């Protein structure tokens, strides 16, 4: 039962053995029942972590490759190693994507959950776009944008920016516009419009939501300065 | 070629994911070459980290198990036993490599590989069960003994290997044998012997020797306390 797998997931977290935490909540996905926000958060942490480890690896190898571009055979081998990372990273992403697409997004009833998963689909397609090239990149970027926009157009109706999942969307969506669409003016305009829509109510937030909101808004604000700089 | 394997190991180190590092340095070693001190250090970094993540996990999971008051505790146990079987598999994977290739092959090299054997038996000893817990610790103390003899005869007390013996061997004594007196004797001997060369140390190994001695000093404080 998934009730056991929830504890198995928490166990796999505390060990820093996220692969098992993901493998648990993945089978919690295949239950077809609607995840509670606790499970949703666990699954997010799980695959965000498992991908993050490969993202960090990939960026490191990618940098090492670009540092040594004159080095011939060992540059070739560094590329072979790098691709031997990328294929892992991609497999993890296609996993989580198909899991969202065939269970969670089909099921998600809450506007909040709809937003969260449509965001998350966007994110993981971005993490693929960061990897991909060519028409693969084109298609993945397109479907990431589609997923974000679908979430964005929903959350704009369904959530104030006083709720952190909307800010999390606005942050990640803006990072997508800057980092992947190469659209820094679009990125800054999106980020700023989200932030100042948050400023308009920034003092109305509840005890946790203000912490959560402030924790995100400081990233919105700092990205805004990073990009305006 | 060994060189491209060593390079892929280095690359995996730089990427900071070590299982492919260890799994390459293994097949570097199966050539039966004497690992030079660089690939020797890479092999240690690799297997040490690959075990160290499991060690951390095990400590965490054992703590959670102790913090249990059920499927809950059973599950905590079953995950622990998975971790332990991983850690055992990896240690066996190292120890057989040393016995088959490395320990079969200089005093420094002898001492390094023998210490390493000792430590991997010690990390089994953290996890071991049944009467063979004795045979594990025995084979560790056997390796450390051959190491301590070779180093006390053929390593100046400046040598960081010779101190790494005493330090780990004392951790074995205190954590595995609960014999703080046995630990502190060897530790103080090594510490003061290094101080007999405190200014004779090499320009880098000053920091090495003093860091090893700081850890000696702190755990000497523990085991005397």
């Amino acid at each position: 039962d998934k009730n056991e797998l929830v504890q198995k997931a928490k166990l796999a977290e505390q060990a820093e053995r996220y692969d098992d935490m993901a493998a648990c909540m993945k089978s919690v996905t295949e239950q077809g029942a609607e995840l509670s926000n606790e499970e949703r958060n666990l699954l997010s942490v799980a695959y965000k972590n498992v991908v993050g480890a490969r993202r960090s690896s990939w960026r490191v190898v990618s940098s090492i490759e670009q540092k040594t571009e004159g080095a011939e055979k060992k540059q070739q081998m560094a590329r072979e190693y790098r691709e031997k990372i990328e294929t892992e990273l991609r497999d993890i992403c296609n996993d989580v994507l198909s899991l969202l697409e065939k269970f969670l997004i089909p099921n998600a009833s809450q506007a909040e959950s709809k937003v969260f998963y449509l965001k998350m689909k966007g994110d993981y397609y971005r993490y693929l776009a960061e990897v991909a090239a060519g028409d693969d990149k084109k298609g993945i970027v397109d479907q990431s944008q589609q997923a974000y926009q679908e979430a964005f157009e929903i959350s704009k109706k369904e959530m104030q920016p006083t709720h952190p999942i909307r800010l999390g969307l606005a942050l990640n969506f803006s990072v997508f516009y800057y980092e992947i669409l190469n659209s820094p003016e679009k990125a800054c305009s999106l980020a700023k419009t989200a932030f100042d829509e948050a400023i308009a109510e920034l003092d109305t937030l509840s005890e946790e939501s203000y912490k959560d909101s402030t924790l995100i808004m400081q990233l919105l604000r700092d990205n805004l300065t990073l990009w305006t700089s | 070629d060994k060189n491209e394997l060593v390079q892929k190991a280095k690359l995996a180190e730089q990427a900071e994911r070590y299982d492919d590092m260890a799994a390459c340095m293994k097949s570097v070693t199966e050539q039966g070459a004497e690992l030079s001190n660089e690939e020797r250090n890479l092999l240690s970094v690799a297997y040490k980290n690959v075990v160290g993540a499991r060690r951390s996990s095990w400590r965490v999971v054992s703590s959670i198990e102790q913090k249990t008051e059920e499927k809950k505790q059973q599950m905590a146990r079953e995950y622990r036993e998975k971790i332990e079987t991983e850690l055992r598999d990896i240690c066996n994977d190292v120890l057989s490599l040393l016995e088959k290739f490395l320990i079969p092959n200089q005093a420094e090299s002898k001492v390094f590989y023998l210490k390493m054997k000792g430590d991997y038996y010690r990390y089994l000893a953290e996890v071991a069960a049944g009467d063979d817990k004795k045979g594990i610790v025995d084979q560790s103390q056997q390796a450390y003994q051959e190491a301590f003899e070779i180093s006390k005869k053929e390593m100046q007390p400046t040598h960081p290997i010779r101190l790494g013996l005493a330090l780990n061997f004392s951790v074995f004594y205190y954590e595995i044998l609960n014999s703080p007196e046995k630990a502190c004797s060897l530790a103080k001997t090594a510490f003061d012997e290094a101080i007999a060369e405190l200014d004779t140390l090499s320009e880098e190994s000053y920091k090495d020797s003093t860091l090893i001695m700081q850890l000696l000093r702190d755990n000497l404080t523990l085991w005397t306390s």
Binding site: L171, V175, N223 | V45, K48, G164, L215, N219
Partner: peptide, 11 residues
């Protein structure tokens, strides 16, 4: 007890 040793952003 112890022993021997060996700019963008998102959500």
């Amino acid at each position: 007890s112890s022993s021997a040793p060996n700019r963008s952003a998102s959500e």
